[PDB]
Design a protein around this motif. Structure first.
Motif, mmCIF file in Angstrom:
data_model
loop_
_atom_site.group_PDB
_atom_site.id
_atom_site.type_symbol
_atom_site.label_atom_id
_atom_site.label_comp_id
_atom_site.label_asym_id
_atom_site.label_seq_id
_atom_site.Cartn_x
_atom_site.Cartn_y
_atom_site.Cartn_z
ATOM 1 N N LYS A 48 0.818 -1.200 0.000
ATOM 2 C CA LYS A 48 0.000 0.000 0.000
ATOM 3 C C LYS A 48 0.854 1.253 0.000
ATOM 4 C CE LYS A 48 -2.879 3.054 2.414
ATOM 5 N NZ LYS A 48 -2.435 4.380 2.923
ATOM 6 N N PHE A 49 1.836 1.308 0.883
ATOM 7 C CA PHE A 49 2.721 2.458 0.877
ATOM 8 C C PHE A 49 3.585 2.492 -0.369
ATOM 9 C CE2 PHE A 49 2.736 3.129 5.820
ATOM 10 C CZ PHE A 49 1.398 3.398 5.785
ATOM 11 N N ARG A 50 3.963 1.332 -0.918
ATOM 12 C CA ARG A 50 4.723 1.365 -2.165
ATOM 13 C C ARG A 50 3.910 1.991 -3.281
ATOM 14 N NH1 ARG A 50 10.350 1.239 -1.794
ATOM 15 N NH2 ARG A 50 10.969 -0.352 -0.278
ATOM 16 N N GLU A 51 2.671 1.525 -3.478
ATOM 17 C CA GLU A 51 1.845 2.145 -4.506
ATOM 18 C C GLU A 51 1.599 3.604 -4.167
ATOM 19 O OE1 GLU A 51 -1.289 3.357 -3.823
ATOM 20 O OE2 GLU A 51 -1.771 2.267 -1.998
ATOM 21 N N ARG A 52 1.582 3.940 -2.878
ATOM 22 C CA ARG A 52 1.430 5.331 -2.501
ATOM 23 C C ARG A 52 2.596 6.151 -3.015
ATOM 24 N NH1 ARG A 52 0.642 6.837 3.868
ATOM 25 N NH2 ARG A 52 -1.289 8.042 3.671
ATOM 26 N N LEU A 53 3.797 5.574 -2.991
ATOM 27 C CA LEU A 53 4.960 6.257 -3.531
ATOM 28 C C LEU A 53 5.117 6.110 -5.027
ATOM 29 C CD1 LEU A 53 7.857 5.414 -1.078
ATOM 30 C CD2 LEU A 53 7.124 7.709 -1.688
ATOM 31 N N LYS A 54 4.306 5.265 -5.659
ATOM 32 C CA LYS A 54 4.550 4.847 -7.035
ATOM 33 C C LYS A 54 4.574 6.014 -8.002
ATOM 34 C CE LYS A 54 1.212 2.208 -8.438
ATOM 35 N NZ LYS A 54 0.459 3.441 -8.801
ATOM 36 N N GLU A 55 3.801 7.046 -7.709
ATOM 37 C CA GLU A 55 3.480 8.102 -8.640
ATOM 38 C C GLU A 55 4.104 9.424 -8.248
ATOM 39 O OE1 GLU A 55 1.952 6.555 -6.468
ATOM 40 O OE2 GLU A 55 0.124 7.389 -5.589
ATOM 41 N N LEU A 56 4.625 9.530 -7.037
ATOM 42 C CA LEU A 56 5.184 10.773 -6.564
ATOM 43 C C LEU A 56 6.581 11.011 -7.110
ATOM 44 C CD1 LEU A 56 4.386 10.281 -2.748
ATOM 45 C CD2 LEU A 56 2.815 10.913 -4.537
ATOM 46 N N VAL A 57 6.932 12.286 -7.244
ATOM 47 C CA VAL A 57 8.303 12.676 -7.620
ATOM 48 C C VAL A 57 9.040 12.693 -6.288
ATOM 49 C CG1 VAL A 57 9.729 14.662 -8.332
ATOM 50 C CG2 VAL A 57 7.920 13.767 -9.815
ATOM 51 N N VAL A 58 9.465 11.507 -5.886
ATOM 52 C CA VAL A 58 10.018 11.236 -4.565
ATOM 53 C C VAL A 58 11.505 11.595 -4.433
ATOM 54 C CG1 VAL A 58 10.346 8.755 -5.167
ATOM 55 C CG2 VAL A 58 10.079 9.448 -2.768
ATOM 56 N N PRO A 59 11.899 12.455 -3.488
ATOM 57 C CA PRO A 59 13.330 12.644 -3.209
ATOM 58 C C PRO A 59 14.023 11.421 -2.626
ATOM 59 C CG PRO A 59 12.134 14.538 -2.489
ATOM 60 C CD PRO A 59 11.113 13.534 -2.860
ATOM 61 N N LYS A 60 15.324 11.335 -2.913
ATOM 62 C CA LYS A 60 16.124 10.170 -2.554
ATOM 63 C C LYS A 60 16.123 9.916 -1.059
ATOM 64 C CE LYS A 60 19.261 7.104 -3.486
ATOM 65 N NZ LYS A 60 18.882 5.679 -3.361
ATOM 66 N N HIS A 61 16.095 10.991 -0.273
ATOM 67 C CA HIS A 61 16.168 10.881 1.178
ATOM 68 C C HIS A 61 15.009 10.048 1.673
ATOM 69 C CE1 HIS A 61 19.050 14.093 0.755
ATOM 70 N NE2 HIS A 61 18.125 14.875 0.229
ATOM 71 N N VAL A 62 13.809 10.495 1.339
ATOM 72 C CA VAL A 62 12.640 9.781 1.783
ATOM 73 C C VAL A 62 12.603 8.394 1.170
ATOM 74 C CG1 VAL A 62 11.406 11.895 2.298
ATOM 75 C CG2 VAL A 62 11.215 10.969 0.044
ATOM 76 N N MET A 63 13.149 8.207 -0.045
ATOM 77 C CA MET A 63 13.074 6.869 -0.623
ATOM 78 C C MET A 63 13.860 5.867 0.198
ATOM 79 S SD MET A 63 13.297 6.995 -4.814
ATOM 80 C CE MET A 63 14.699 8.033 -5.087
ATOM 81 N N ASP A 64 15.137 6.155 0.454
ATOM 82 C CA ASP A 64 15.938 5.170 1.170
ATOM 83 C C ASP A 64 15.452 5.000 2.597
ATOM 84 O OD1 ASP A 64 17.087 7.339 2.690
ATOM 85 O OD2 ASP A 64 19.048 7.049 1.874
ATOM 86 N N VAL A 65 14.992 6.093 3.206
ATOM 87 C CA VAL A 65 14.527 5.973 4.571
ATOM 88 C C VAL A 65 13.285 5.105 4.597
ATOM 89 C CG1 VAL A 65 13.358 7.314 6.388
ATOM 90 C CG2 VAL A 65 15.599 8.087 5.458
ATOM 91 N N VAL A 66 12.423 5.270 3.597
ATOM 92 C CA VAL A 66 11.215 4.474 3.528
ATOM 93 C C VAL A 66 11.549 3.021 3.300
ATOM 94 C CG1 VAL A 66 9.278 3.969 1.963
ATOM 95 C CG2 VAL A 66 9.598 6.263 2.856
ATOM 96 N N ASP A 67 12.572 2.748 2.509
ATOM 97 C CA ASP A 67 12.892 1.352 2.249
ATOM 98 C C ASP A 67 13.439 0.679 3.492
ATOM 99 O OD1 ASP A 67 12.223 2.194 -0.323
ATOM 100 O OD2 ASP A 67 14.322 2.678 -0.728
#
Lengths: 55, 55
Positions: free
Chosen positions: B22-41
């Motif tokens: 659910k959170f992955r699809e939530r991020l699927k479409e956003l222009v996500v910065p690297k910081h939040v990406m790695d922290v989220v992973d």
């Protein structure tokens, strides 16, 4: 053992469901705004997830 | 050993997998910065690791 006997017969077995439903019914008659309804519902769900003892 | 892992009823929580996707699809479409990406992973790995009721 004491807890289980009070929890399954003596006292309230569904404390979560009880307040969850009782809040809903207390909320029935008022004309509650949508601004409210969304927050109260998501929070009530949040209440539905967590363990009874959570601080 | 792989099938032994799979053929068990103590594997990865279904609830966590649903939130994971659910959170992955939530991020699927956003222009996500690297910081939040790695922290989220890393936090998602932590989500996979943890038990379903810990605070």
């Amino acid at each position: 053992q004491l807890k289980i006997i009070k929890k399954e017969l003596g006292l309230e077995k569904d404390d979560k469901d009880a307040i969850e439903e009782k809040f809903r019914e207390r909320l029935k008659e008022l004309v509650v705004p949508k601004h409210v309804m969304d927050v109260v519902d998501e929070e009530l769900s949040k209440l539905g997830l967590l363990d009874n003892h959570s601080s």
